[PDB]
Amino acid sequence: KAEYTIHIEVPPNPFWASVGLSIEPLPIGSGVQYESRVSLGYLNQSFQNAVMEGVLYGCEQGLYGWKVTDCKICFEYGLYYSPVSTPADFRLLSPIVLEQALKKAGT
Amino acid sequence: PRRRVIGQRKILPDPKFGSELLAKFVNILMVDGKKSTAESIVYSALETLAQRSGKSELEAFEVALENVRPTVEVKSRRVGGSTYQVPVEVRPVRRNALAMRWIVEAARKRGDKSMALRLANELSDAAENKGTAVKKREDVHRMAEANKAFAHYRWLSLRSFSHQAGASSKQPALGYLN
Amino acid sequence: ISPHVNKDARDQYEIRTHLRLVDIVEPTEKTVDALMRLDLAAGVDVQISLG
Amino acid sequence: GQKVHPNGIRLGIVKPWNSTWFANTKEFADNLDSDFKVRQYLTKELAKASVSRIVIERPAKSIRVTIHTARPGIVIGKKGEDVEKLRKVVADIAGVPAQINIAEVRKPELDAKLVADSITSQLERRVMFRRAMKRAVQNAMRLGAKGIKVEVSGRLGGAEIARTEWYREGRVPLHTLRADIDYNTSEAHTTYGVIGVKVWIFKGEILGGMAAVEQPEKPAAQPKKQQRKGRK
Amino acid sequence: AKQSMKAREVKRVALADKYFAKRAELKAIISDVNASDEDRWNAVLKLQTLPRDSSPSRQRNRCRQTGRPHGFLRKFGLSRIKVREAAMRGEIPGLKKASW
RNA sequence: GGCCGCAAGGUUAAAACUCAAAUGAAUUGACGGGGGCCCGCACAAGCGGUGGAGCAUGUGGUUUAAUUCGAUGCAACGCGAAGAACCUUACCUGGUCUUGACAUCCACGGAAGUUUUCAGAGAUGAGAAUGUGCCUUCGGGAACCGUGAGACAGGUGCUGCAUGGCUGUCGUCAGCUCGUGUUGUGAAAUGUUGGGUUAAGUCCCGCAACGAGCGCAACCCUUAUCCUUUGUUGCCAGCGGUCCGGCCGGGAACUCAAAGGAGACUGCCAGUGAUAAACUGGAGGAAGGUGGGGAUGACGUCAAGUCAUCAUGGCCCUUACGACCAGGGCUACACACGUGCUACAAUGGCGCAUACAAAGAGAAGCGACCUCGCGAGAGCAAGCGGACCUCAUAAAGUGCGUCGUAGUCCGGAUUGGAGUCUGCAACUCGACUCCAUGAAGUCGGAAUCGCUAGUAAUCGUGGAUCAGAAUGCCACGGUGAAUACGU
């Protein structure tokens, strides 16, 4: 697993955002399994979802580049910023967090 | 401006020397608010002077006083692209303050067995000066000589104000009459 | 001064109490009460004891 | 920016307190808390309701409660039976006996407290509303006060954000101590949020219930009396 | 704030009490100044240990009306910002703005 | 493509594509390393602190089972959460409960309650003894406890861009605004700008502008010169005992306490100026220009802060974002910062002698004399609810001896040992006292901040909060400067 943010420090701005996951390999033939966490009340209102729609988008990202199989994905934490973030963003963020991680790890 | 105008801050004379300049010399020697100590230092430090010069305390005293501190100093700042320290007359009272600070300044020089002896030190140093500070400051004189440079402005002050001018400074801006 | 934060600020208020000997050194049927109240209350508070 | 309550400044120089009893340090707090308990325990009977708000005294060795109505027939009830039930409700709450209280208000749209709330009740709820304030002011002018301001906030018009409107007539000085006068500020609940109302009423240059200084002593203090000189 | 912290404090006042409170008068002479040993040992000193909690250390308390802690006066038993309100409001007798 | 010229170059002069405007003018807002002008400790003219050293303390960083956060240049960091062993508490580990620790409707079984043993870290569980109350028609009912269901309670749990109430800050800055008339097709102008003057849209003068409201300013608190009533828990001039406390006989001149009254308006005189307003000079006055200080924060704003006072909508768990208990954590650690403390001494330290305060708390509390101990402190105990008492010979300062720049006769972080204190309990991780030990520090970079006089600088005291426990915060009195040309 892993975390990813889009935050920057040189311009006035900060462009924050950020999420942390657990992506862990499963027994062969288990397929694709989902958990959140922060969606109890904080991530969630349309944001629960999205992060799940983000994984479904993420099926068209990767290293080889396509589909997830197996594996379980857990949305452990994250932080939006209210006047720039939306459901989404999260999602756009969440398949980048999933791609980076898969790149870090190795496929 | 500021705005706002008001100056120095009145002082009583401090009880030994009956003078406001003495403090004033107490503070300009004072640290922190210990005026009792600091008075005790200034009278000790003059009693040593102080034995260190002359034979008394006050004769220093004016030698340091004279140093030490002046008559000139410098004013800032700024003129075109730069800032300069241009010479002016001190401030009559400040200076001092000049300084009283130079004699205490520094001191502090430092060294250390008593203030303080440090007074002080210098009065002995300064003061004869020859003391540090007297050299202080000379630096004032530096200066500043540096700076002599000029300051006026820059064109406008030197700048645009033609009056009597010989400048053409300050006054409106003047033609004939009415 | 704020519900939350802060420098600085803070905050300032007062209350507070006048007092106290009136304070009288002896009771009387009309000063008894009040004496009753005075306490009856509330806006005043009254002690009577000699101590 | 932010302001003082006209109020409150304020008290003890132009305006009475809130409650009026002695407590503290060993009983002050607690109490103060009883309170606070009276509040909440009595005021849910008042809320239905024309009471604006209440004042507490505490005399004692009782409690407490002076009530300004608004309304008074609606809180007194048939032959006074409720004012006896009011309270019995004091108490309950609390540790002493409790007494009610009467209060009369008020010129009722003069307030604020009762004017607000009258517009808070319309906004609760919700009605066309908006309006309301205009109104309320007219109202209040109206019945009495030399000027009145009203302000209504929270979110306004149903919403997404937040919000606020005001009106206001005559006025209304602010810094004049001071005085007085008033004043407020009351809220809240509705299905979209909290709703809030302020009211400020300038009565003119008139003296208050006190304050701050007493009248002159020298008439007070006179020199002609006998004394101390103690301590004997 | 929470109703559990309020609560707890009123439970704790409470219990404590039966214990503190009465205990404490014993502590300390049964250990500490004091104590004989017969004590302190613990055990006799378990009289202090068993209730805990009821202890003043904890009892604390805190406000209270709002309940909250670490932000109240206490002389009034009140929060704080609620003292403050309150004050404007005049709900506390004699209490006013502040100036000097 | 054509045309002109030796030619660079000139000339005639498109289209496809593409954007949703581009463009002239004027008004309002806002801005300038454009002009004029006024002011603020804004800068100078000065004084003193701050950066380097060690520590106090909050935030960030690193770390951890956990280290509760929010805030984050102004608008954050000794702030809100004013005093985290525990509780408080957010967090972690382990134990443990599910109509619940708290709460309402309803029914069923028991009065509430008291006493008591044992397992267990305790929560919790089981056993044993014991009371039989209150209202009453003595039927029955209520209180309080236990059990049980549909609801539901509970949530320091999210959302401050859902919202109220409250607050920061520009800043006590001099501004803000409406009605009517006039003026412009209009934004809007006029008034609110001009002239004199001011701390100021302050005051006065004057014009197609006029009329009116809010802010500025008074009120109201505080400080102190004076007039006056009064006299203990206060005072003491002339009288008196007391080997010297107004203790007490005595006294009311006086201090003080705190109640009422007087005073300041450029008023008055002289000068300037539009014979204005105002300003300068002077007398009178305790004080001269709201005498000084405070409360006071308009209109408007950062799409400011507040789910952590409080309120309350939305969203969400109750198989718990609830709740009980023992222990742990909030305090860990090669870091960095914001803010604070303390020293480097000699107009300082140390030992002895020694003078002059304000303010504030105290009914399971404060506390002298006296007794015990080296001492924290404890014992004993007058007094008191404080104008009645204690902190208390306040310290700096004053008198005397001593030190000579030596890392000291300074500093005294660190570190060993022992004693005292609150509390269930001082292991991580509190405070105080005694003995011993011992380090950086020689007045500190790029740099920087507060202050115009009873101010700064500098010395001590008290309180909230508070079982106990500040070098922060709030308030107090002592000593008490330098300099202010210039703009």
Structure tokens belonging to residue E38? 């017969």
Distance CA D69, CA D79 (A): 17
CA distance C15 to chain D (A): 10
Task: Please tell me what resolution, in angstroms, this structure has.
Answer: 9.8
Going from N- to C-terminal start, the domains of chain D cover 16-106, 107-206
Burial label, B153 (beta-carbon count in 10 A; 0-12, 13-18, 19+): exposed
Task: Name residue B64's amino acid.
Answer: A
Distance CA D129, CA D190 (A): 15
Tell me if residue D78 falls in helix, strand or coil.
helix
Q: Which of A56, A47, A40, A57 is nearest to A90 (CA)?
A: A47
Distance CA A56, CA B143 (A): 80
Residue C40 CB contacts under 8 Å (≥ 6 apart), including other chains: D59
Going from N- to C-terminal start, the domains of chain E cover 1-90
Question: Do the beta carbons of residue D110 and residue D143 sit within 8 Å?
Answer: yes
Protein-nucleic contacts, chain D 188-217 to strand F, CB < 7 Å: 189-198, 202, 213-217
In this structure, the strands spanning A33-35 and A19-24 are unpaired
Strand partners, D166: D151
Spatial strand order of the sheet with D196-202 comes to D165-166, D147-153, D196-202
**How many Cβ atoms from other residues are within 10 Å of residue A58's Cβ?**
19
Question: Do the beta carbons of residue D173 and residue D146 sit within 8 Å?
Answer: no
**Chain E residues within 8 A of D32 when measuring between CB atoms:** 76-78, 92
Which of D9, D21, D32 is the best residue to mutate to test the E interface, defined by the most E CB atoms within 10 Å of its own CB?
Answer: D32
Phi, psi of A98 (to 5 degrees): -65, -45
Tell me if residue A19 falls in helix, strand or coil.
strand
DSSP for residue D76? H
DSSP for residue A92? -
Q: Which of A12, A13, A19 is nearest to A39 (CA)?
A: A19
CA distance C28 to chain E (A): 32
Q: Which of E83, E93, E96 lies at the smallest CB-CB distance from C14? A: E96
Angle at E89 between CA E87 and CA E90, to 5 degrees: 60
CA distance E90 to chain C (A): 12
Tell me if residue D74 falls in helix, strand or coil.
helix
Residue E41 CB contacts under 8 Å (≥ 6 apart), including other chains: none
Distance CA D134, CA D56 (A): 34
Q: Which of D25, D84, D90 is nearest to D54 (CA)?
A: D90
Strand partners, A72: A24, A33
Query: Is the pair B, D in contact (3+ CB pairs within 8 Å)?
Result: no
Distance CA E30, CA E45 (A): 7
Q: Please tell me if residue C15 touches chain D, with a CB cutoff of 8 Å.
A: no
Q: Which of A55, A53, A46 is nearest to A86 (CA)?
A: A46
Instruction: Name the D residues in 57-76 with CB < 8 Å from any C CB.
Output: 57, 59
Distance CA D201, CA D169 (A): 10
Tell me if residue A23 falls in helix, strand or coil.
strand
**Chain E residues within 8 A of D16 when measuring between CB atoms:** 90
Structure tokens belonging to residue A63? 């290293």
Contact C43 E95 (CB under 8 A): no
Distance CA D81, CA D93 (A): 19
Sign of CA dihedral B48, B54, B55, B57: negative
Question: Do the beta carbons of residue A55 and residue A94 sit within 8 Å?
Answer: yes
**Chain C residues within 8 A of E96 when measuring between CB atoms:** 13-15
Angle at D130 between CA D129 and CA D133, to 5 degrees: 80
Q: Which of D95, D112, D50, D56 is nearest to D75 (CA)?
A: D50
Question: Do the beta carbons of residue B53 and residue B122 sit within 8 Å?
Answer: no
Q: Which of A16, A22, A28 is nearest to A3 (CA)?
A: A22
Question: Do the beta carbons of residue D66 and residue D57 sit within 8 Å?
Answer: yes
Distance CA C5, CA C7 (A): 7
Residue B89 CB contacts under 8 Å (≥ 6 apart), including other chains: B71, B72
**Chain E residues within 8 A of D5 when measuring between CB atoms:** 88
Q: Which H or E run includes A93?
A: helix A93-99
Q: Which of D16, D17, D28 lies at the smallest CB-CB distance from E76? A: D28
Distances (CA, A) of D8 to A48, D4, D53, D150, D205: 50, 8, 16, 18, 18
Tell me if residue E38 falls in helix, strand or coil.
coil
Q: Which of A47, A46, A23, A19 is nearest to A35 (CA)?
A: A23
Question: Do the beta carbons of residue D79 and residue D69 sit within 8 Å?
Answer: no
Distances (CA, A) of C10 to D8, D177, E99: 17, 22, 13
Question: Do the beta carbons of residue C15 and residue D11 sit within 8 Å?
Answer: no
Distance CA B21, CA B36 (A): 17
Task: Write down the residue that tokens 């003296």 correspond to.
Answer: D207
- What dihedral angle (degrees, nearest 10) is formed by the CA atoms of B79, B85, B86, B89? 150
Distance CA E65, CA E63 (A): 6
Distance CA E17, CA E45 (A): 19
Question: Do the beta carbons of residue D149 and residue D200 sit within 8 Å?
Answer: yes
Distances (CA, A) of E71 to E7, E38, E62: 19, 45, 8
Q: Which H or E run includes A58?
A: helix A52-58
